[PDB]
């Protein structure tokens, strides 16, 4: 049995956000939705998060993960940032005071954290009957760490923060993940015997190492090779290197199942994207949130998807789009701005400089040029000429047009809604539709052709015009 | 003398793909393409392709390939996968029973490797008096490749396949690049006593390396440094990989020739493409299939060009565009889609929010606004307006415009196609051209302009514009 | 007292370019500018900079940058490039006969050297009291620099030039930077002995380390151990390289200043881009020359702004922009293209697909889609009605229109400049407005539409059209 804490009651100062650091997001999870995910995944009996001053705004979220994951998350409140351990000590409040499972402890800044890694540690723990457990990895660079003091023969000693570590230990490259696995009562023991004068004047949670040690506990550093694991985020550059390197994974994922992705570095998929069988993604693409696209699709290059689901065999070439679907064999792009609500049928084609918001486009039809669909029902089969508007504004409300199937309409035409236009109907080139439009029936608007002969040698004389058609009228 | 194998005939199963692995494609040719250039470039007297179930999709190209490398190439067919060893017997089988020149064998999965690798391979091979000689590297990550088994004199002894190593022999560092040269007799000797129990369950060619060594013949292994040339690719996150480092090579060939690349990382230019000295290739681009772009061009960022050529002074930002032609000095971008059969002169503009296809634009002419232009020809220093339309498609079929030389035609004309209009002459903005369009006249065809006075007070009253006029009324 | 000179002097072969090479730019400026900015914040009491032969090209900007930096910066000619030591003869031309002061050297293609790596040269020099301290790094790869000769106590005796370097030399991986502190007597005397005959034919400065040692002079070697500091460009290899690593430590000074960058590698920052806290800058961005960004504000991806200042809490996505303002709270994108001029007020809304060149809009104003404004002035709160054109142009010259505040004009409008539309006025749908049009009036052009029965069966008999129709009249 097992009780894990998620500290996530610091300031988060080096982030110099205004938003809270747990709350920043990669790969369209916020960090702590990633640690809250992965614990409960290992679905430990206890899951408590501690909360500081901006709990207000953070713990809700909480309460939405607890539904998502299916289970309880208790929140703790931490009052004010005194460190680690005193963050531990607010966490075990929330736990019975006979409490007598394991407890684990994780920051909420190491958002590459895993049910695996956790499993692991708490196997280890209770292996080699710890009292306690950290996890550890080595870097090429430790500075921001504590540094794991060992002994030849590796049993750990102790932990030094960077803030307090001497020349000599700054040198040291293994360092602490901030992970840890607590027989309880130990725990609780060190945790009364914390002082808070070291550089940070804080209560570390780093110091009951050395405290269990002298006590002569079991006291255990288990090592993960994988570093970027329990890599930990106190600023926005560590926090673009681990999306950086969680995106590598996500794409290395795709690829291993058959998705061809001819940039992985500059192609960004969110957790929850899935992708077809020998779909091609070109590079500059992010799909984000819950996209989903199918199989044998071209994707890219230089295009954003968000919440879109594409069918099988479709093109999405540099579009921007999100919340709208995009049906089987259709073709979108490049240069395309889809907006909620929009769904295109199988084989359908939104071409380059279109817009659409709110509309629903049957198969086999195409807006294929320069045209703004608003607020509209479009058929099957049909034909919007270039340069249209479905104008859907009447300069203070919004209204909705209806479009039949096999319709051929010219180019320049203006659906002034609400209007509809029958099956198979037609519009000429420059046509402003004001009213309904039957099947069949040509509409049109605009008037006779006038040709005003001379005009250019008369109006703009001199001009380089003037003196070509003076030229063609011998020749 | 020397006979070139190639093995493209394993199922490829790592790739998932319906496509065959040795078709999937870098920098515009297909792994197999890229191994037969390179080998051609040798120019051995014998080049034979194994394949095996899937030969009738690849065939064909070998075929394409014999053809544009101007020799021979057969294929020999390997009815089932049963191992790199059985298929190097089905390529024997494509040479005469008393071949008695060298037979080199290499993989269709190596598409870094280079002639002159290859003669070198052949070289050493010839100096040492081989019975065998291997191509080896050394990799950080030696996964996946068989293992260099070598005595401290550094005489090798053996090739065991990642599948069959101890733990021991999967720490070696040395890989086989699967690319040998072999005294033909002493091939066939050893291929003839292959045993197929392994873990793969399959006749390893890698297996004739200690068969040699036991036999007292000289065994060789030629280490390559640049270990890229002979990376294999097994599956897709490996093919990114290469495809990554190829074009790192082939970008950095551009720059040392002249080009500034601002950001080789996102420029992606395939082999065959040619760009002119001075040239600036701003981030997000890439140049593709036969593209050419002259000297002191301007491209990117964000451009796609696939067959196009660009002239010298040309400048093509923010252009997605294929199988065109864009004469020196002339501007495309930002925002410009070419599709085939565009051709725009020298001084010629087609600006943001435009659309060509299958038209010709003559010397000096700007179509710099919201236009597509479609099976146009259009003469020498014209303008055509912003939110122009040549109206190509009359419901069932694709008509032409002519437009001539110095015209200044209206802001929204559709040319409702086939019209011609002639040289010098104007269209009014919103016209709508259904008839020829004389020399020097000007065409118009909206109506007057009325206005309304004081509708907005009557029909959007109370609302914010009738307060503003009812404001502007006073004042 | 220090006099500090610049070599730039040599041709730049390598570059290959008829641009002169300290003129090639990364993060918006000059190599040669880089290079006067850090020297002018030592401020030295002379700054000399010897020219060649393009001394006319470059001498303007020298004076340029001394007008920037407020202070004299001297210029020597070097008439033929005879090599280093000779450049290096030709700058203390420059100075008196008598300057008693420290002489310090460097290059203009090492365009990251900085103040704080020159001010700790000189008090190196000083401190061990050193005839010559040259600074040196270490290198993966030293190719090309000129190598430093040690013995086992780390005392220099010499640099080897790659040129003249024996295989053994060439393996040494501490390089010369090229960045020198001379006691100037010391220098003066050294160099007057200098000979060519060496495999550049060159007077090189870099023998003058080897010269002043055997004089049994001080002879120091300071060692940088961030490389990146004194690397050099003598190719476009290097050069985007150099930017490369420029570019990311500009970014990474954003992040920890408070700016969320997506992806650090594909967003390029020039050096004097300012950036407000919480805003957010997705992949594929460039903010360049002296673009400025405010707080909250959510940029790119792919966008690439141009001297453009954004206010807080502003969108800009998709945009290519330049020399334009961008108010509070604005929206533009995606896909919209900003020319000079531009000024859009807080509120204001730029979407898809339109372009806006020296025009300025008003507080809260929406220009939505498709749309051209050239030469316009709009007031607030207006709506510009999707595909319109400000129409400018009359063929031969420009023109400006003039458009209030609360209007509402309609979808595909073309303002026939030079016109005025009063204020809280209205346009219908394809209106052509070639008069003024009064506050609080709807002005209306198109002509009545007409439909014209039964006209697809009649005139596309047998069309998928006409037989839509037909079963739509039973059905
Ligand atoms: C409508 C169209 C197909 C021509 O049809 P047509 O039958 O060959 O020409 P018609 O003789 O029948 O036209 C019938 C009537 O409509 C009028 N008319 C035709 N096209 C018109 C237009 N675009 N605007 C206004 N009136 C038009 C004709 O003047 C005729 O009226 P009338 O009998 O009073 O003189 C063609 O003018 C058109 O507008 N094509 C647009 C195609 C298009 O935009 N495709 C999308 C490209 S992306
Ligand atoms: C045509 C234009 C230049 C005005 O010409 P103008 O000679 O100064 O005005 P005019 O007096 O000669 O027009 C001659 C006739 O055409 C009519 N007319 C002019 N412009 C018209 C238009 N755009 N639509 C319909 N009729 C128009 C005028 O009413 C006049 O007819 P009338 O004599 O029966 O009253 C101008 O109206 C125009 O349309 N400019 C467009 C420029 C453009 O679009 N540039 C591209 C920008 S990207
Ligand atoms: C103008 C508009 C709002 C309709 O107004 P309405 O008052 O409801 O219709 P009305 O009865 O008052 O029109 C008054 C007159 O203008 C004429 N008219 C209206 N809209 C017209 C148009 N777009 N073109 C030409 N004439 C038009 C009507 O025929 C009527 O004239 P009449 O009295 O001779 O028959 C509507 O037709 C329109 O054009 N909407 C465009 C909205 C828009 O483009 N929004 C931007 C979307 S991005
Ligand atoms: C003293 C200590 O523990 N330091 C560890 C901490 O450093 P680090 O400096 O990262 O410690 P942080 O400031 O990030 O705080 C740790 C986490 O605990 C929470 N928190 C912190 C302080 C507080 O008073 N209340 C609170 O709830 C925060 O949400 C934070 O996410 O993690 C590193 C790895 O990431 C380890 O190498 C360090 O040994
Ligand atoms: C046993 C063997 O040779 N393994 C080598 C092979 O591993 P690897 O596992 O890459 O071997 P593959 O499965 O890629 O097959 C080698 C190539 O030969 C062809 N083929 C393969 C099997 C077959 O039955 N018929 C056939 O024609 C395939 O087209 C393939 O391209 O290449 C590696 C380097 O890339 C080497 O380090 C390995 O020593
Ligand atoms: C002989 C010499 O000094 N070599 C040094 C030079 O190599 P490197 O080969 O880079 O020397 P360059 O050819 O770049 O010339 C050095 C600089 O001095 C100027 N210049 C050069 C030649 C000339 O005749 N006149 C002139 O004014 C050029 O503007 C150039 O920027 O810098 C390297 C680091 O960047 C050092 O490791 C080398 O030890
Ligand atoms: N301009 C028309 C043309 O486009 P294009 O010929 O450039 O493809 O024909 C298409 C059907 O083939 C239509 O969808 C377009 O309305
Ligand atoms: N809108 C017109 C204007 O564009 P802009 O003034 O924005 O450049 O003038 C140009 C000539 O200079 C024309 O090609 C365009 O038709
Ligand atoms: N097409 C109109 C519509 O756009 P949309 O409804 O797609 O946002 O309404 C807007 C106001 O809300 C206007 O600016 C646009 O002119
Ligand atoms: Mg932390
Ligand atoms: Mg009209
Ligand atoms: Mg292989
Ligand atoms: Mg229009
Ligand atoms: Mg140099
Ligand atoms: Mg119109």
Same mark, same amino acid.
């Given at each position: =049995?097992?009780?894990?804490?998620?500290?996530?009651?610091?300031?988060?100062?080096?982030?110099?956000?205004?938003?809270?650091?747990?709350?920043?997001?990669?790969?369209?999870?916020?960090?702590?939705?990633?640690?809250?995910?992965? $614990?409960?995944?290992?679905?430990?009996?206890?899951?408590?998060?501690?909360?500081?001053?901006?709990?207000?705004?953070?713990?809700?979220?909480?309460?939405?993960?607890?539904?998502?994951?299916?289970?309880?998350?208790?929140? *703790?409140?931490?009052?004010?940032?005194? &460190?680690?351990?005193?963050?531990?000590?607010?966490?075990?409040?929330?736990?019975?005071?006979?409490?007598?499972?394991?407890?684990?402890?994780?920051?909420?800044?190491?958002?590459?954290?895993?049910?695996?890694?956790? *499993?692991?540690?708490?196997?280890?723990?209770?292996?080699? #009957?710890?009292?306690?457990?950290?996890?550890?990895?080595?870097?090429?660079?430790? @500075?921001?760490?504590?540094?794991?003091?060992?002994?030849?023969?590796?049993?750990?000693?102790?932990?030094?923060?960077?803030?307090?570590?001497?020349? #000599?230990?700054?040198?040291?490259?293994?360092?602490?993940?901030?992970?840890?696995? @607590?027989?309880?009562?130990?725990?609780?023991?060190?945790?009364?015997?914390?002082?808070?004068?070291?550089?940070?004047?804080?209560?570390?949670?780093?110091?009951?190492?050395?405290?269990?040690?002298?006590?002569?506990?079991?006291?255990?550093?288990?090592?993960?090779? =994988?570093?970027?694991?329990?890599?930990?985020? +106190?600023?926005?550059?560590?926090?673009?290197?681990?999306?950086?390197?969680?995106?590598?994974?996500?794409?290395?994922?795709?690829?291993?199942?058959?998705?061809?992705?001819?940039?992985?570095?500059?192609?960004?998929?969110?957790?929850?994207?899935?992708?077809?069988?020998?779909?091609?993604?070109?590079?500059?693409?992010?799909?984000?949130?819950?996209?989903?696209?199918?199989?044998?699709?071209?994707?890219?290059?230089?295009?954003?998807?968000?919440?879109?689901?594409? &069918?099988?065999?479709? #093109?999405?070439?540099?579009?921007?789009?999100?919340?709208? #679907?995009?049906?089987?064999?259709?073709?979108?792009?490049?240069?395309?701005?889809?907006?909620?609500?929009?769904?295109?049928?199988?084989?359908?084609?939104?071409?380059?400089?279109?817009?659409?918001? +709110?509309?629903?486009?049957?198969?086999?039809?195409?807006?294929?040029?320069?045209?703004?669909?608003?607020?509209?029902? $479009?058929?099957?089969?049909? +034909? $919007?000429?270039?340069?249209?508007?479905?104008?859907?504004?009447? &300069?203070?409300?919004?209204?909705?047009?209806?479009?039949?199937?096999?319709?051929?309409?010219?180019?320049?035409?203006?659906?002034?809604?609400?209007?509809?236009?029958?099956?198979?109907?037609?519009? &000429?080139?420059?046509?402003?539709?004001?009213?309904?439009?039957?099947?069949? *029936?040509?509409?049109?608007?605009?008037?006779?052709?006038? +040709?005003?002969?001379?005009?250019?040698?008369?109006?703009?004389?001199?001009?380089?015009?003037?003196?070509?058609?003076?030229?063609?009228?011998?020749?």
């Amino acid at each position: =049995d097992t009780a894990v804490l998620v500290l996530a009651a610091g300031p988060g100062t080096r982030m110099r956000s205004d938003t809270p650091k747990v709350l920043h997001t990669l790969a369209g999870r916020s960090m702590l939705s990633h640690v809250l995910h992965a $614990i409960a995944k290992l679905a430990p009996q206890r899951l408590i998060v501690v909360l500081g001053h901006d709990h207000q705004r953070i713990a809700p979220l909480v309460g939405e993960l607890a539904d998502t994951l299916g289970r309880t998350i208790d929140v *703790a409140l931490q009052d004010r940032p005194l &460190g680690t351990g005193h963050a531990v000590l607010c966490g075990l409040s929330a736990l019975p005071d006979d409490y007598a499972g394991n407890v684990v402890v994780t920051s909420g800044d190491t958002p590459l954290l895993d049910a695996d890694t956790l *499993a692991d540690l708490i196997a280890t723990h209770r292996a080699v #009957s710890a009292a306690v457990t950290v996890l550890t990895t080595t870097l090429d660079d430790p @500075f921001g760490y504590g540094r794991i003091l060992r002994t030849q023969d590796h049993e750990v000693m102790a932990i030094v923060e960077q803030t307090d570590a001497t020349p #000599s230990q700054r040198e040291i490259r293994e360092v602490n993940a901030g992970v840890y696995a @607590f027989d309880i009562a130990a725990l609780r023991s060190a945790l009364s015997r914390l002082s808070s004068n070291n550089a940070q004047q804080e209560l570390y949670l780093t110091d009951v190492i050395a405290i269990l040690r002298s006590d002569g506990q079991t006291v255990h550093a288990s090592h993960v090779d =994988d570093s970027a694991l329990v890599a930990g985020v +106190n600023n926005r550059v560590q926090l673009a290197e681990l999306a950086s390197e969680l995106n590598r994974r996500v794409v290395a994922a795709h690829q291993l199942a058959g998705v061809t992705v001819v940039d992985p570095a500059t192609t960004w998929i969110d957790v929850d994207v899935t992708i077809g069988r020998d779909t091609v993604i070109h590079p500059g693409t992010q799909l984000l949130g819950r996209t989903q696209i199918g199989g044998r699709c071209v994707v890219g290059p230089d295009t954003t998807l968000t919440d879109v689901a594409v &069918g099988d065999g479709a #093109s999405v070439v540099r579009t921007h789009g999100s919340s709208s #679907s995009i049906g089987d064999g259709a073709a979108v792009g490049p240069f395309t701005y889809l907006r909620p609500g929009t769904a295109l049928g199988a084989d359908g084609k939104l071409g380059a400089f279109v817009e659409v918001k +709110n509309s629903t486009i049957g198969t086999g039809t195409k807006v294929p040029h320069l045209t703004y669909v608003g607020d509209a029902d $479009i058929g099957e089969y049909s +034909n $919007i000429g270039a340069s249209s508007v479905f104008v859907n504004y009447d &300069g203070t409300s919004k209204r909705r047009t209806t479009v039949g199937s096999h319709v051929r309409t010219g180019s320049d035409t203006m659906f002034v809604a609400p209007v509809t236009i029958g099956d198979g109907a037609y519009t &000429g080139a420059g046509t402003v539709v004001r009213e309904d439009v039957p099947p069949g *029936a040509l509409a049109v608007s605009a008037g006779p052709q006038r +040709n005003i002969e001379n005009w250019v040698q008369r109006k703009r004389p001199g001009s380089p015009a003037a003196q070509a058609s003076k030229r063609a009228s011998e020749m």
